[model samples]
Target: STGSATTTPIDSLDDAYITPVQIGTPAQTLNLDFDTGSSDLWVFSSETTASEVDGQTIYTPSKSTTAKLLSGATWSISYGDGSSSSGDVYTDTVSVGGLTVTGQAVESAKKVSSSFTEDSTIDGLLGLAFSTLNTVSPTQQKTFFDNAKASLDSPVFTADLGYHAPGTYNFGFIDTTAYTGSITYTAVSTKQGFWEWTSTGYAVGSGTFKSTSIDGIADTGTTLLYLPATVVSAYWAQVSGAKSSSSVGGYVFPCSATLPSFTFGVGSARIVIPGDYIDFGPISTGSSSCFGGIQSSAGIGINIFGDVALKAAFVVFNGATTPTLGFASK
Candidate 1:
């Protein structure tokens, strides 16, 4: 049967969105981030050290009758932001909305970095990327989506990430009513286990669209849009008081600057990111300087179309056939 789940913004940070997930026999519920950039379903668990647990909830395998240790299996992951976790493995039933997968590989975190321990609200991460990217050793594991896809009416899911608002993650089916206009489709390259694609070009404000091609990944886990350094410099140049701030670790500008709208090319279709979204709140509370939502992808090598870009449109992660990405105005 087809299933769907609702997701809500964690806070004003708008850094990530979370959905409810159930694991094991009696079904322990946890709020998990549905990340499209990585593949590994890991959670804070009883195995985690108490000193490192902080205020996050932990999954207890001993309490679940269906939980079984996956002998000789282990996992370790480090995100682009440097947040990391390492854990052992267990096989159990996992469910999202009405869809459930039995014998799913669940990583039980034994160690977590400060980035995760301090974030008390995020109990775990539900990876939506391809199973080939799963980090479990000895035998790689399958993602919840990968295990559940065959039971779904269609091997697809949609991410409706909102700005400081609630959104929905629909599984196995696309809701036409969730978006307006027609959905524009573009081919995706999943060789790297990410929804990677090339944009034909982009334009700042109402300026003419250039023909430059940019290869980037659609990452729901990332907070801002990351493009080539030169591209970022060009966009920031348009803002009156914009400057690259080593102190802030990104480009910053006067809070009152008149920012220009940014648009990315998808095939012949254009997805416009409003100027206001680029403001990205203030550099600090009570500060007049603000950080930009779009930055350079210099060290990362590949550009990232993060939440700031994804929220501006309804995104479809189409796994069928050649695996395409569909974008529509929200």
Candidate 2:
């Protein structure tokens, strides 16, 4: 039954945690961050020390009568920020936005750091990027979206709807109301585990750029766009009088000056990045919070085109019929 209906607004319960389902029963629920950068599903558990559970949601095995812990297999996760967590493997049914799936693999952290527990609003991270990147095995044991894709009545997509401040991108089918133009597509390259491209420079104030080329990966998981040092710094240097400051790992800049408009080549199509979106947040050490386009990552796995860049347009990661990326107006 391809399912039914359109534009269903699921409830966002405050205390209601997102849980994994087993068969038809609630197995375990953990707080998680919905990420588009990478594909993986992880949760913190009671097994983690009390210190780790300080402010974070901890899944109590006792609370979930159906949850089963794996004896031999152990799982650990490390984020780009250098945060790490480790725990045993377990199985349970999982659920998201009220939809349920069974026999899902889950990781229960036995040790975690304060960075994870300090964030009151962040429980855990939920990766909606790709099934091939899922932390779970068997391929069949993918994510909530992967399992639900076949059941949805219509074509599903997510929107990180930003309001006055940064907003959220919705998921589950495309939202036509948000855009007008026909979608644009690009072929996917599996070799990199990311969708990468070279942009033909950028222009501020106006949405056009010279045909200069630059490269980066399209990542939904990351919040900001980190450009190449020379390319990004040279672009930022154009700002009349932008100030610079030092951050934990990189330099930051902030300026009230008008940003130049720019565009890049995504094959034959030109992709644009807006000006306001280019303003770097405030900095403490240096003069400006804005940064010199690129961030320094001595040992990073991927240089990304994060949500800050992708949210500018509609993006479709076609996994089923065609392994391609589709873009449209948002």
Candidate 3:
């Protein structure tokens, strides 16, 4: 499933999401989702005074003798999902496999009411995903990489976020040897905005949503790809046996056959999303399983190309050098 390319434009914000590395004991290492959509590395704290959400994990600093928290900083984040978390910021020494980075910024939320706090597998999230969208002091910024980058063996950091499967999102030093060719680089945009780009148009199941063009952003913090409604309904019509079903306040599809492919035209780049990514969680019904590829977004201007599209390639955000974020295949 691996491909090659040095660099490409990120037409959506979901592409910027990278998996976060949760540091703990030998039996508790994990790579969770790291988002740029918001700048905050919050892990469920055993110190939390609130209830935990399903599929979320909580962490206890006392369990790790090496962990530390920032002395006086407080933090909080509100998600679009009607969930929120608030806590204090601290500095801790964290490691991923053989890579150890010290003085990492961490938010130990004393309270959380979000629906995303129920997993028993991982401990926290890292916010290297982006900068401007972060919630914190306008001056004393605390990104995971800003303080910890000096500890890395190399200047370049690469994330191998392997889709939805276990152990997919791997963070640490980039394994230059793993790539078969040179890395393509793109300059970051000067707006210091979320990694935004343009889309030539939308294509669902090999058909075009419109020949028109649009600009979009890549966001890792979001779970699914969100497109304009005009583009969405038009694309769904092309699916051979696709039908709408209700799900999580959105429209899901029920189709028993192999779904069609979807792609977005980004100027010269054609980013394709596989069938399995569309049929999220592989929900099938009888000979015709429910499709996972496309879903409703309740109308948002931004079109997010979430993890489903990111897991398919290697992406690099040139925050240090340019005004724009770039993408390349692994």
Model 3 over residues 252-285: C-alpha lDDT tens digits? Answer: 5554556666776645555567766666533533
Q: What stretches of model 2 exceed 4 Å from their correct place? A: 1-31, 131-141, 153-156, 161-172, 195-201, 205-208, 212-215, 243-248, 261-265, 285-301
lDDT of each: 0.90, 0.54, 0.55
User: Local error of candidate 1 at 180, Å?
Assistant: 0.9
Question: Candidate 1, clashing residue pairs?
Answer: none
Point out where model 3 deviates above 4 Å.
Answer: 1-31, 50-58, 62-69, 137-139, 150-156, 163-193, 208-212, 240-248, 281-291, 296-298
lDDT of 3 at 152: 45
In angstroms, the error of model 1 at 143 is 0.9
lDDT string, candidate 2, 88-115, tens digits: 7666666665555455566677777677
User: Where does model 1 exceed 4 Å of error?
Assistant: none
The TM-score measured for candidate 2 stands at 0.76
